[PDB]
Design a protein around this ligand. Structure first.
Ligand SMILES: [Br-]
Ligand SMILES: [Br-]
Ligand SMILES: [Br-]
Ligand SMILES: [Br-]
Lengths: 74, 73
């Protein structure tokens, strides 16, 4: 019943080629972080979630709607 | 080189317990998309980036600053 929020800040390096049309090619992520960053960060964020006390339950399923906004660093 | 932006939209289901103090425990993500969803989606979003034509290069490195904003449905 209580909605919860996800707010995760991060950075990720990418390496790629640029072709004569100005498009990227041969892209690889440079994961600095131990793989599977997104799922770890989501679980970590869920540590801040709080629900009503004295109402425990098990096997609760929630659907998280998210948007990722990013920009290249200048 | 030109700055670029990225926007990814998505959903992820998670399953967990709620303890007497109202905190979550025993969390598992219910992957329904293939693993490495984030990395795949970043690369797919880069398909929209455009740099100056006639100026190819290889091994270009850029850092993407991002924020993930989510809400339970
Ligand atoms: Br925390
Ligand atoms: Br609640
Ligand atoms: Br450029
Ligand atoms: Br597209």
């Amino acid at each position: 019943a209580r909605a919860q929020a996800l707010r995760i800040e991060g950075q990720v390096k990418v390496k790629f080629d640029v072709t004569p049309d100005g498009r990227v090619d041969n892209v690889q992520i440079l994961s600095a972080k131990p793989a599977n960053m997104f799922e770890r960060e989501v679980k970590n964020a869920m540590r801040r979630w709080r629900y009503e006390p004295g109402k425990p339950g098990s096997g609760i399923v929630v659907n998280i709607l998210f948007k990722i906004n990013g920009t290249t660093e200048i």
